[PDB]
Amino acid sequence: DKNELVQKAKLAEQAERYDDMAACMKSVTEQGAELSNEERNLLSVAYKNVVGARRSSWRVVSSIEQKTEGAEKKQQMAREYREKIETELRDICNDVLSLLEKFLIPNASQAESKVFYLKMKGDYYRYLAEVAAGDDKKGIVDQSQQAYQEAFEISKKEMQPTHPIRLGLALNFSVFYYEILNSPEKACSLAKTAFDEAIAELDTLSEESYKDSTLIMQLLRDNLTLWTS
């Protein structure tokens, strides 16, 4: 039941067993009921870690596959291993994206939830895009963009500039433009706007989210300076 799976997911997280945590939260989501903010965050955190791991490994091996050009047998091994990781990476992403289409997004009644899950949809298509090569990449990139774009629109319309979800959406949307679309200026402009917009209205902050908001704002400017220096 809900509470039991949620509690188990809290245990899994404590044990840093995010596969267990993701599985619990997946079961909670599959119960068809709209997730509370707590349940929503548990689901988010779990899969972020599950996918985050494969993404990290992917970059390591990919970085090795390139660093072994001219070393045929080495490079072929790194390539094959990379491909293996990609399969895991994709399965994870498709798992999340499915949960978003079948439960989270549809069941989203409030604008807040809508923006969060649309952002999440953008995130994982982006992760798919990160390892996409060939025919599938173009579609994948547009799925992410369209998810982000709708979320971005809704967030600007229904949320104050200092909202962690809005700021977080802007952050990842900007990263998408830079890393996926190779559009630095667009990435920077989106990040700079979200930051400045939040700065001009620090009164809209909340005693329970001002830390999250301020952190994300710091991450925004960080990416900005990175994409310049």
């Binding site: 970059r59 995130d123 700021l167 977080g168 952050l171 990842n172 900007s174 990263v175 830079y178 890393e179 994300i216 991450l219 960080d222 990416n223 990175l226 994409w227």
Partner: peptide, 7 residues
């Protein structure tokens, strides 16, 4: 590249 910070 150097992976940018996401959220």
């Amino acid at each position: 590249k150097d992976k940018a910070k996401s959220c």
